[model samples]
Target chain A: SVGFYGKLAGRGDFVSRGLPNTFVEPWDAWLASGMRASQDELGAAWLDAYLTSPLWRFAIAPGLLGGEAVTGVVMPSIDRVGRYFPLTVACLLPANADLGGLVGGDDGWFEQVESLLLSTLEPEAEVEAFEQAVAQLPAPPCPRIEQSLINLLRSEAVTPAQRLAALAQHACDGASHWWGRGSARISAGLMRYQGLPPAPAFGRFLTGEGEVIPLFPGIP
Target chain B: VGFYGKLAGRGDFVSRGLPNTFVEPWDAWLASGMRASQDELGAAWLDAYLTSPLWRFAIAPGLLGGEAVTGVVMPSIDRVGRYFPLTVACLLPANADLGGLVGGDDGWFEQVESLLLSTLEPEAEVEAFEQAVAQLPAPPCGPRIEQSLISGNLLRSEAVTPAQRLAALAQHACDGASHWWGRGSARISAGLMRYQGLPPAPAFGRFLTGE
Candidate 1:
């Protein structure tokens, strides 16, 4: 009945958790550095090339690496960054047990396994073990589930209009339900993918025109 | 002494007092409708347009606007909607201040006059006046000033490679100054205009490469 599986608890719960309140810290730095560095090291034309390169695809790294933890951590002596999404999802959607899966589970199942394995390890020795497991996590040749979801919406089962509507509801609901508390965290990457502000739902992604796609059936 | 000015009583606040939180029943409905309409629209061609707008820019309206609020909200709403920057600059910092300008002597400024004139009728009744005035405010006209500040290194005279570090110290000093609270609010929109999420600074803007 609730969006995001009724996770957002009362307001202020997000800030109460020790998460970064905004998405400007290391993201901005990365962006700034990448922009300046590429432009500085290479010419402006090369910087343009870099921005367009697959290596610069904002979604890939965070989605691949632990985006939530790596970019912006003010404090040093924290638990391995992997717990961010799980703890957040647990906080938001108490009912959803598979918060770890939400981050990369549907597609990158191995990462989810690694997360569990790390969590089960001793607190003192978990970091290195987890890192080793993560490093060893095979790059499964699976198509991205999120993209598959996008394709599912684009499939013939539904009209383009219906598909888009369905995709938005499904993706947003799936994300909110799975990563409700950590919706903010998951959204940091998702928004970068779609290029918009993080909302409980994927409203920003759907709203802008070129920010994502065009579902107007007959149009090219 | 201070970054730009004070915060508590110096400048305007962002989402707090002046630019009322965007949660009015009508505004909320419009915002929601905008969301629904967009979803009803798809994003498949986003890659195409964003990559090569010549092929995709034409189809943007279809994705951005829908049946309900489309004609009213989408096409007309420039990147930041009607929240005109000069008027906002005249009033609060973070958001729009429709009534704030009406309350003060500075209310007679050209920006305020332009806002009222463009929005209201020459001889409308009170209800219509309120309705017309309540339409969404405009976005800032220029790239936010703080963006300029950071890119300009307003804190230091040099364009340091570590703009973030240099800007952070300035921001911290600003927050600690007596005018921190007031200046914070007034500066909040400009701040948000540039926010990057992990930290309390601005996000990268169009200035990076393609406008």
Candidate 2:
């Protein structure tokens, strides 16, 4: 019974922890951008205002506008010591999608990013609530998305490779340094309305206090 | 609905980008504002403001999905509350009706012009375009052209007029195109692209902002 502990960690955690912060940083921005864009209020014609705004820059543009397949995801940043509930998130990438630009390479140029994308959403209350929240927003031209919630568990608790192998059972392939790049495109826009509290499924993870822990890379 | 609004964050699906795991929620994202100053969004700082709720209210008509009402119009409030970008849900256009184009598809740009027109009020944009041309003071030579430019509706109730042709030609004229016509055209193209689901390229965005 760790009482209740929750925190948010990012690549900066990696930076201060004496590790390279390259890969996970932009993801932090992408999520930040995506989340704010979707949840804010621009009135009834919010979609139009969004189309005409810079927040839209971070967005994939609505389907009517020709954006690629896009969906939001929530990954639990399962931490034991700090007791963080969830942290990083990314959209599902196509198979062998080049993550070099977003995350960089592994072992001096032999980098391959696995599709951490789950083709399907697992049946959990958390996942379902996410889908329901996704429904309220404006409909798009229909890019593919899953109501998924993957566990980006603590690196200290599970080796990053093991996490990938488990993720590979559903996420697609073996992983590499590029795994950290998922945050760039991974959007949590569908998570909920802006400024609302998290769903009850996640509500359990919240203690009165919150912390900022560093996220580590998936290094071997 | 006929189509939905599929949205992708800077990296929504491919890599990762959501707020700090829904822990602190708003404050956690607000905390990210600090990160921005540490070498991010210098210009993005303004971009942040324009897209935020703090901006002034300007409104337009729209066809919001799921609602029976097609023309939902209202004033502006920031889409997200914070200066930093936040997670906001969007309606992704269902692929059911659209022609085959998915992520990383090679031919998005050309297909864009058609697919974009496929959506939209159509009237609203052309109206916006014609509105641009209408405001110009008529040159002494073509009050008749002014009639075409200002006549009932620019949607063109009948065949194009000869005077209208001259005015259209003015748009192609070097001076006119560089001025109002050029700006109008850029705004029209940018709006179409925005409707079709892409950010306006920086140059066009500057044109929209009059930057």
Badly placed stretches (over 4 Å) of model 1 are A1-123, A126-128, A138-180, A183-220, B1-66, B69-211
Q: Model 2 — TM-score against the truth?
A: 0.17
Q: Compared with the true structure, what per-residue lDDT tens digits does model 2 show for residues A127-158?
A: 33333333332321111111122111111102
Poorly placed runs, candidate 2 (over 4 Å): A1-74, A77-84, A87-192, A195-220, B1-211
Candidate 1 chain A least-lDDT 10 residues: A1-10
TM-score against native, each model: 0.20, 0.17
Consecutive 10-residue window with the lowest summed lDDT within model 2 chain B:
B174-183
Best by TM-score: 1
Superposition error at B84 for model 1 (Å): 41
Error of 2 at A18 (Å): 8.9
Locate the minimum summed-lDDT window of 10 residues in model 1 chain B.
Answer: B53-62
lDDT of 2: 0.22
- Residue A220 in model 2: shift from native, Å? 49
Each prediction's RMSD over C-alphas, in Å, is: 22.9, 26.7
- lDDT of candidate 1 over A1-220, digit per residue (tens): 0001101112212122222323324333433343444444445444233322220011122222223212111110112332111111111122212221233223333234324333533444543343354344432221111222111111121122222222222222222211111122112122222222232222222111122232111112
